[PDB]
Amino acid sequence: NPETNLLFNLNSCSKSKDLSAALALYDAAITSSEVRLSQQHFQTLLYLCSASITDISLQYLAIDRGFEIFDRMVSSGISPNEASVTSVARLAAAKGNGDYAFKVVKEFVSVGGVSIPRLRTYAPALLCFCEKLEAEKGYEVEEHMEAAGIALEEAEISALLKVSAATGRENKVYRYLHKLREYVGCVSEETLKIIEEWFCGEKAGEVGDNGIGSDVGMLREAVLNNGGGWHGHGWVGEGKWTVKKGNVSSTGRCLSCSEQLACVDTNEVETQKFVDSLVALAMDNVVFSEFQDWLEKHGDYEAIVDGANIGLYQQNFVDGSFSLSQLESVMKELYRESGNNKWPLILLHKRRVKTLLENPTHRNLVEEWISNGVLYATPPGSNDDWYWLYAAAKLKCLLVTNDEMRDHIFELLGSTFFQKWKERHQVRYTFVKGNLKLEMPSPFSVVIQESEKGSWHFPVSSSRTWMCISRQ
Ligand SMILES: [Zn+2]
Known part of the structure; x- marks a missing residue:
């Protein structure tokens, strides 16, 4: 042709x-x-x-x-x-x-x-x-x-x-x-x-x-x-x-x-839209519906911690886990920084929580957190949890995590707003042969x-x- x-x-x-x-x-x-x-x-x-x-x-x-x-x-x-x-x-x-x-x-x-x-x-x-x-x-x-x-x-x-x-x-x-x-x-x-x-x-x-x-x-x-x-x-x-x-x-x-x-x-209308976005992907459950209801009852927390991130930092996949010592530390420093009023919520999987319960040393302490409301157990099947991301954003409070989270799943959601919110709310830590120095x-x-x-x-x-x- x-x-x-x-x-x-x-x-x-x-x-x-x-x-x-x-x-x-x-x-x-x-x-x-x-x-x-x-x-x-x-x-x-x-x-x-x-x-x-x-x-x-x-x-x-x-x-x-x-x-x-x-x-x-x-x-x-x-x-x-x-x-x-x-x-x-x-x-x-x-x-x-x-x-x-x-x-x-x-x-x-x-x-x-x-x-x-x-x-x-x-x-x-x-x-x-x-x-x-x-x-x-x-x-x-x-x-x-x-x-x-x-x-x-x-x-x-x-x-x-x-x-x-x-x-x-x-x-x-x-x-x-x-x-x-x-x-x-x-x-x-x-x-x-x-x-x-x-x-x-x-x-x-x-x-x-x-x-x-x-x-x-x-x-x-x-x-x-x-x-x-x-x-x-x-x-x-x-x-x-x-x-x-x-x-x-x-x-x-x-x-x-x-x-x-x-x-x-960070912009209010932007806050809700970020919240709505993560929540929608979550229902695709009733376990999360429990969480939404749960947080409102237990409100409000000035800071929130990524349980998984703390414990595996910084020892090797020996497993070398799990440092409640490092978890307990962040709670100690935060309380004095936050002052005498509020305690920071920690989100950890039931797997991590149960193994911690199994240890005789730790059992009294962790249960104390769970009864108080300072610990929450994320259910199985999920996830790189937004449980703390949702809770941090919903409360517009602080987040403690070492995750840069520069990954495709995150970055598709991740925007111009995300970098604003991260500088706004993310806390960083370093651990060397001692205790934590907190970046803010x-x-x-x-x-x-x-x-x-x-x-x-x-x-x-x-x-x-x-x-x-x-x-x-
Ligand atoms: Zn000037």
Whole structure:
């Protein structure tokens, strides 16, 4: 078949990205048999056109050809492909005509049958509008983006931030800086420069004062309610900005302004969704239903320990197990750290618990824990238990485990939230020819933080570098 030979040649070109040769085949194809071109043909062509954009020696023709080529099999009546609509959008946005990029996507999301509207489609439309400083246009595409709707990755927000800065929109820069906090922690270098230029901007300094102006009392109460990080109400204080780029202390005190960063507080809606996720995989039982009911009755525990992890650490699979000596130690250190009120729950398998019961030495002590409620026996058939993970997350309390748990089963669930929660809650231990030295979750967040006085702090993507923002 002549056409199938053509698809081989088109794909052969796309491999080596020779769009000029692909163009000659395309021009020849319209003349040749006459051929009817399958949708794959200029799928390949449009895909190659955008691939060409980044290159210079081929870009200019791709712009000229891309629109007409696109319109050629659009004529066939196939609702354009999600990928293809991104391609023409890139071509448009690449050289001036951002508005075509916007308009084709809007017409696209209208279909909805197999629209599958991806952010990357919306992207070139917004970026081009941003570079041309069309602010209201950019806000409008964002509004549609939220509506469909994929939330914004960093690149899109930073570009949106840049425009509000250039157009001197005070309130919009405030919103988008908060938008950045919510969806990014440590920021890129490119964005960092954008943030820096705004605060040094005379517009920001002069007008920045807003009233409000008061009061720190309401602010500290409002900053607390939203976690450590931020208060919603607006701008604070009067005068011009002072910008400092500095490291931070072990205590998390910013060296420049002598204020320490608040602890990261994980998002509530995120907490429940993590809980719901693990719980769902659990029922596929009544034993776990007992556990849910059980914990609520016995609440609440300030810390929780991974029983298995402690005991096998650090002796070899001789079996060399099982060190209740090491388990008993963590209980001892934690109580004084926790103080005189609460004891840490330990989750161990019945197998481990029964063998411990069998030992005459340990039996009185372990039973004391079980009767008190300081020990719980995970039933057979399960698992690398979420029993403590659930309990730690449900109580939003501490977790004691040496598991990095960087495994496929864990990592599929493991996200951006997971690393936040781990730094937030995980405790680590080391044992050498003595007793435990306890590593703790960091007292301060590594994330964008907002203060009632001023203040804006930005980490950068450990001798980490930060940005400090101070008013007067
Ligand atoms: Zn500071």
